[PDB]
């Protein structure tokens, strides 16, 4: 028993006609996926189809393979090319064949570092290819047998046997098959092609080994109930009985989110909407804490010039608590606006703001210049030129040393007034009260979906209840310390909690040299609510599907549960399901009169096993 | 032959633990097992007699 | 979960004049795999350039587009009458594809 | 055992993996026990292969069984003294099976052999 | 030469279900990538899924998961999408769309193009 | 939904090692129980027959 | 508690002359204020009157007692509520 990647049984597999002739030609391959390997199956009697092409891009940015057969040596390449959009190879006789077979597929092959030249793969001889790409090894599986058949796929069993495990290490995406047509936009001739494609899946398979060598027989565990009781049992052949083989569940159909109401909103309209702003060289550092800060709100909005934020990401920011905020302000040119970064020097970053190489925080900011300039300048903001020595990060003085900024309204950007906002978030040891947002969903109901109701998760059906809680309760719990009852956050209504269906599943089946017929029980399900085809009948131990209750009563043959029986019966032939008898009415006459005294006599021999030992083994 | 014995000493409990448990449930379930062969044997030696 | 923001919300210009859209990036575009639409009202959007710097043939040559990183931008050298609508940044260099928000550019 | 362990979780479920086949002895012992307390039911009350019945007239030269047959007029079927038997004595992958012999045939199996014991 | 073309208009009550079908005319459709975009009044552009009908597994938004399948119809070469459990914001109106180039890797889906060729638009109203 | 999946690989083997013990010694207590349910039964029957 | 003051009220009408009554009463949850302080004393609060000797009062008492960490076993009804307690420490 092996799980790997497989082909199912009895699937459709796409038969493509590469070229067709009607009268007349018709020329059309196409580009497929690759999702977990391929099985490719042909038949054509011809020098046609040699070679294939793998890869992501199929251009030069990235690498590509390139398999080609020449009925002389197979060559398998691995480099950058730069395939044309309809690659092919042409063979161009000087002479018939065997001439100078010209490359139209790529015009560039460069930087590439794979090589691997052997025997012809390509050796009415129908072949089949299995691809696979694990881990950085492709590895390629072939077969050819001789069939008879007009156009179909035999009805036999052939295993294929490895070829190559080259070591190559790219990505592989996409793929294209290759087609040498011939020399004699219309200067080239074909007969015709078709090929079969299939696809790879993850299945269990139970393969049979004989004496000798080979495979002979393979069983899919997932076609019908069956072949799941002989992949159970690891036979070919069931005997006559009842045997449990799988689990059934049902799964969420959607998903919950509960949370209290939005309120409490932090200000953060006071630091950026308002009509003063400090200067560079005098801050306005505010302090902000047990608030609910809305950050989704500066991240979204189509007016900030400038949003390059260090130490965390601006998406995350919502999933995270902090102690304290710190808010500052400036009003500088827009020429410095670069200068304000943990690594950066010049004026402003070392005399009147600087910042450590652990901000963790960031500088959004954006410009104004018909509100912040009038028609005369009003020169009003200023800094500082010269210092006796460097300032450290996160400190500065409230103190001609300054000089003001002109901001004429004419200049172009580099100079214009452009204000800045900075953000830092500490985390002291401290029940840190400042958190994000948290949103809410719909609440629907009624079906087995997962909920997250205020910090409890799970998963299950919700309904109204009759319960009477305390107005400071939030949640129930039952005897085992497990969770009952909950509290909408919104609405204050008590809602049950039950989880949705779950059971067993088992096969009814006679024996296996009778029929192949079979009857399916699912245990304490009442299926009404089954996703799932026979004749349906409910029990005490679930329900029955394939089976017909027949009217009667005999001896039990296949136990089920709660004095139901089932058997395999004729009358055509059939499984029935009947309630078991205990046997016949023996009615005795009795008088105060009669007695009965037997006559003639028999003997009788029975026999009798019982086991006495077991065999003696010792382990070290 | 593919770690330093530093780090080899580590790797090799997790097995010894393992193989432990799952020599001690056989002898568990054995003597259990081993229980009722002797009632049998009472009872045949009875119905010899 | 890669989000864009077009920073000018809307832009009013003149005829002849050059035009500037930005699409400022969350994080990293991978391979740098950007695709601009423009729409017009009761009408199904409309691609115009994709990777960034190629153009789809049939466009007019007065549009072009570059950056990268995490910064993208439009340019429309010679503005015309038939050019005023939304236009929308798209990427597709990862999973799920997400949208810009939309910059109109008009007249009236 | 796999729901108990790990409830519905396939990182769990991938570490679960590499300890072995410890689950299936656990389920093959609860299964062999469950299998077990049918036979011993069905040794203990299933000695006849017959059905036997009292006569329609009670005359037994003075005895007085009445407290031990059935009775018609309740639903049941029982004893009076078996009623007062029967009402004197009173999720994470847990599951409870049902017997195969339902409570009325147990009865009809005592009564059985009540009526072949006395005629 | 490749067209494709959508249902009409529909109008719902809450709690109900809707499914819009889209038929492509005029190319091969069997290893194009098939998208599905909402639009509502006044906002911009969502995406909600997409299938590689050859493959036969598609790909869906966190936000509608649980809420909306998609399937197609290889035969009769149609893209079905449908949706449940429907509310008052579901009001919008929905694009087909293709995308030429896309490839598979693994269990999830690679594009190497944009979205060229659109449908038409199907306007689903849910009210009472 | 708290932690890296190199770090969150640890913790979980010790739930799963407590659980699978809590586990084995119900099993255990079962078989040891049951095995005397059936020396009851055998005397019932002995004392119906 | 771990940087949470925690209060806990509840207000009942008695009749008795200077005692506390003789029955079974369950106070309520208050509030549960985030503050991250230590806390090692505690003093009352008394707003007399204004009518060094130029204030007035009527009159006040109050009992103080302390807890300690003990294990009880409490039992609750078909409702809600909480209606018996048991001290495993008495005897
Ligand atoms: C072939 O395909 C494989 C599979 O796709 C591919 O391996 C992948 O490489 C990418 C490289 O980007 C890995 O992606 C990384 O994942 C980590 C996981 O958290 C991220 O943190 C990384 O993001 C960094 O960069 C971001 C900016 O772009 C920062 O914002 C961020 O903070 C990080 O610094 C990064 O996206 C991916 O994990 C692997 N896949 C697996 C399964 O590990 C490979 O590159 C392809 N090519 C070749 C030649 O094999
Ligand atoms: C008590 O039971 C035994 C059998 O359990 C009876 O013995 C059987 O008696 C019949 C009748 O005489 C024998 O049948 C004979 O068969 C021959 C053919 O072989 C036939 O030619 C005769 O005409 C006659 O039908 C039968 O063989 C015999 N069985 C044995 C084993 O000997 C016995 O008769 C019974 N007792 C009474 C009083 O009926
Ligand atoms: C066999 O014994 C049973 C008793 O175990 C007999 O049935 C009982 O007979 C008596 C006498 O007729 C009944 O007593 C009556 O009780 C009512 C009160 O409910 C009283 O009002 C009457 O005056 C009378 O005393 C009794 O109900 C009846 N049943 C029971 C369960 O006791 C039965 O008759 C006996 N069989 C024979 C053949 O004698
Ligand atoms: C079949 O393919 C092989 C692999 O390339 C060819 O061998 C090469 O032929 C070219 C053409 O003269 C030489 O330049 C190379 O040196 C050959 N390589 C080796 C390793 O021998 C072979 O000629 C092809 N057969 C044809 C085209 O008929
Ligand atoms: C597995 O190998 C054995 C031995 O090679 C095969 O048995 C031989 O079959 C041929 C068939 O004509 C006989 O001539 C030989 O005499 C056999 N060998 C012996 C030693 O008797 C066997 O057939 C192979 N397995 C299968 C399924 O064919
Ligand atoms: C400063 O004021 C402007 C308006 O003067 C605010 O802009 C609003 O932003 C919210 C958030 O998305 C929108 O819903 C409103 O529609 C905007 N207003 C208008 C008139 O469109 C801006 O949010 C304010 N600043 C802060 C920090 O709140
Ligand atoms: C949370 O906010 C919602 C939205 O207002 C509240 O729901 C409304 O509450 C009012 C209160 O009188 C009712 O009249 C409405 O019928 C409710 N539903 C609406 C407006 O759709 C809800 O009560 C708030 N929660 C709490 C605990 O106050
Ligand atoms: C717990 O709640 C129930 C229901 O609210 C209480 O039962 C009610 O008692 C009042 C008392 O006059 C009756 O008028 C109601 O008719 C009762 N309800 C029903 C549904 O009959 C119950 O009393 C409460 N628990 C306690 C200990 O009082
Ligand atoms: C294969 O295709 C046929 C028709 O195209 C269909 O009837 C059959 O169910 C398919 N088999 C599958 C899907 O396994
Ligand atoms: C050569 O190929 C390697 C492997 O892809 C790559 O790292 C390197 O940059 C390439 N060099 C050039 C010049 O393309
Ligand atoms: C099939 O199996 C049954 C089960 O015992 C057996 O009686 C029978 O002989 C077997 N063979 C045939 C041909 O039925
Ligand atoms: C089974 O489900 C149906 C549908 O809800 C219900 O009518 C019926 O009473 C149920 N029966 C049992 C035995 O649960
Ligand atoms: C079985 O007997 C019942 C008794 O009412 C009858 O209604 C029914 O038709 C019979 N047959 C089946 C198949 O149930």
């Known amino acids: 028993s092996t799980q790997d990647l497989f082909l199912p049984f009895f699937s459709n597999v796409t038969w493509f006609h590469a070229i067709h002739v009607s009268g007349t030609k018709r020329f059309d391959n196409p580009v497929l996926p690759f999702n977990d390997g391929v099985y490719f199956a042909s038949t054509e009697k011809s020098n046609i189809i040699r070679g294939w092409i793998f890869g992501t891009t199929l251009d030069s940015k990235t690498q590509s393979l390139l398999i080609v057969n020449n009925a002389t040596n197979v060559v398998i390449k691995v480099c950058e090319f730069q395939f044309c959009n309809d690659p092919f190879l042409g063979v161009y006789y000087h002479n018939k064949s065997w001439m100078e077979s010209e490359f139209r597929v790529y015009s560039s092959a460069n930087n590439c570092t794979f090589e691997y030249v052997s025997q012809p793969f390509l050796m009415k001889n129908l072949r089949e290819f299995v691809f696979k790409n694990i881990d950085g090894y492709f590895k390629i599986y072939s077969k050819h047998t001789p069939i008879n058949l007009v156009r179909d796929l035999p009805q036999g069993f052939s295993a294929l046997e490895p070829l190559v495990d080259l070591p190559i290490g790219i990505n592989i995406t996409r793929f294209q098959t290759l087609l040498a047509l011939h020399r004699s936009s219309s200067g080239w001739t074909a007969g015709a092609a078709a090929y079969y494609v299939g696809y790879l899946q993850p299945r269990t398979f139970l393969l049979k080994y004989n004496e000798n060598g080979t495979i002979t027989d393979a069983v899919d565990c997932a076609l019908d109930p069956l072949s799941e009781t002989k992949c159970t049992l690891k036979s070919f052949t069931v005997e006559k009985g009842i045997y449990q083989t799988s689990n059934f569940r049902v799964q969420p159909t959607e998903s919950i989110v509960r949370f209290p109401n939005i309120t409490n909103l932090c200000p953060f309209g006071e630091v950026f909407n308002a009509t003063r702003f400090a200067s560079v060289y005098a801050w306005n550092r505010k302090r902000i804490s047990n608030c609910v800060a809305d950050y989704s709100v500066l991240y979204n909005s189509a007016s900030f010039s400038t949003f390059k934020c260090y130490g965390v990401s601006p998406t995350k920011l919502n999933d995270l608590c902090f102690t304290n905020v710190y808010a500052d302000s400036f009003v500088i040119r827009g020429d410095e606006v670069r200068q304000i970064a943990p690594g950066q020097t010049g004026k402003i970053a070392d005399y009147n703001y600087k910042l450590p190489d652990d901000f963790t925080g960031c500088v959004i900011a954006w410009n104004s210049n018909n509100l912040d300039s009038k028609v005369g300048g009003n020169y009003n903001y200023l800094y500082r030129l010269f210092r006796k020595s460097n300032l450290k990060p996160f400190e500065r003085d409230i103190s001609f040393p300054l000089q003001s900024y002109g901001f004429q309204p004419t200049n172009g950007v580099g100079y214009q007034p452009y204000r800045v906002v900075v953000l830092s978030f500490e985390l002291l040891h401290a029940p840190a009260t400042v958190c994000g947002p948290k949103k809410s969903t719909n609440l629907v109901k009624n079906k087995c979906v997962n909920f997250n109701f205020n910090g409890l998760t799970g998963t299950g059906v919700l309904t109204e209840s009759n319960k009477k809680f305390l107005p400071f309760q939030q949640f129930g719990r039952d005897i085992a310390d497990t969770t009952d009852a909950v509290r909408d956050p919104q609405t204050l209504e008590i809602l049950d909690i039950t989880p949705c269906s779950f059971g067993g599943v088992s096969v009814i089946t006679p024996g296996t040299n009778t029929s192949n017929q079979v009857a399916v029980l699912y245990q304490d399900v009442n299926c009404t609510e089954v996703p799932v085809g026979s004749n349906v009948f409910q029990t005490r131990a679930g329900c029955l599907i394939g089976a017909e209750h027949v009217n009667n009563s005999y001896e039990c043959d296949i136990p089920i549960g709660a004095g139901i029986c089932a058997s395999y019966q004729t009358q055509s032939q059939s499984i029935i399901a009947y309630t078991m008898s205990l046997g016949a009415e023996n009615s005795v006459a009795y008088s105060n009169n009669s007695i009965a005294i037997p006559t003639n006599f028999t003997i009788s021999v029975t026999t009798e096993i019982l086991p006495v030992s077991m065999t003696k083994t010792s382990v070290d | 032959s593919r770690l330093d014995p530093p780090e080899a000493e580590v790797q090799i409990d997790r097995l010894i633990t393992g193989r432990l448990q799952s020599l001690q449930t056989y002898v568990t379930q054995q003597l259990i097992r081993a229980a009722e062969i002797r009632a049998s044997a009472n009872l045949a030696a009875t119905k010899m007699s | 979960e890669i989000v864009l923001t077009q920073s000018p919300g809307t832009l009013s210009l003149s005829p002849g004049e050059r035009a500037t859209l930005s699409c400022r990036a969350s994080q990293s575009v991978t391979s740098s795999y950007l695709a601009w639409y423009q729409q017009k009202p009761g009408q199904a959007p409309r691609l115009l350039i994709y990777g960034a710097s190629s153009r789809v043939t049939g466009i007019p040559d007065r549009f072009s587009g570059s950056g990268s990183g995490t910064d993208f931008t439009l340019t429309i050298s010679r503005l015309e009458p038939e050019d005023f609508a939304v236009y929308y940044c798209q990427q597709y260099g990862s999973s799920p594809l997400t949208f810009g928000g939309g910059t109109k550019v008009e007249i009236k | 055992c796999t729901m108990y362990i790990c409830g519905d979780s396939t990182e769990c479920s991938n570490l679960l993996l590499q300890y072995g086949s410890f689950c299936t002895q656990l389920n093959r012992a609860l299964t062999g026990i469950a299998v077990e307390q049918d036979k011993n039911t069905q040794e203990v009350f299933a000695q006849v292969k017959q059905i036997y019945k009292t006569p ?11 407290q031990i047959l059935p009775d018609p007029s309740k639903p049941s079927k029982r004893s009076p003294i078996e009623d007062l038997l029967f009402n004197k004595v009173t999720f994470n992958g847990l599951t409870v099976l049902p017997p195969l012999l339902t409570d009325e045939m147990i009865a009809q199996y005592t009564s059985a052999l009540l009526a072949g014991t006395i005629t | 030469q490749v067209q ?17 079908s889209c038929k492509a005319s005029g190319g091969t459709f069997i290893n194009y990538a098939v998208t599905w975009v909402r639009q509502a009044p006044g906002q911009g552009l969502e995406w909600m899924g ?24 290889k035969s009769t070469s149609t893209a079905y999408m449908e949706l449940s459990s429907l509310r008052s914001e579901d009001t919008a109106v929905y694009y087909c769309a293709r995308v030429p180039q896309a490839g598979a890797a693994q269990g999830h889906y690679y594009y190497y193009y944009g979205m060229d060729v659109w449908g038409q638009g199907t306007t689903v109203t849910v009210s009472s």
């Open chain 5, 4 to 20: 494709l073309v959508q249902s009409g208009a529909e109008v719902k009550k809450p709690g109900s279900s809707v499914k819009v």
């Open chain 5, 50 to 73: 997409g299938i590689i009908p050859i493959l036969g597994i598609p790909n869906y938004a966190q936000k509608f998961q649980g809420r909306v399948t998609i399937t197609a119809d």
């Open chain 4, 56 to 66: 329609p007239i009670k005359d037994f030269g003075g005895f007085n069984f009445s």
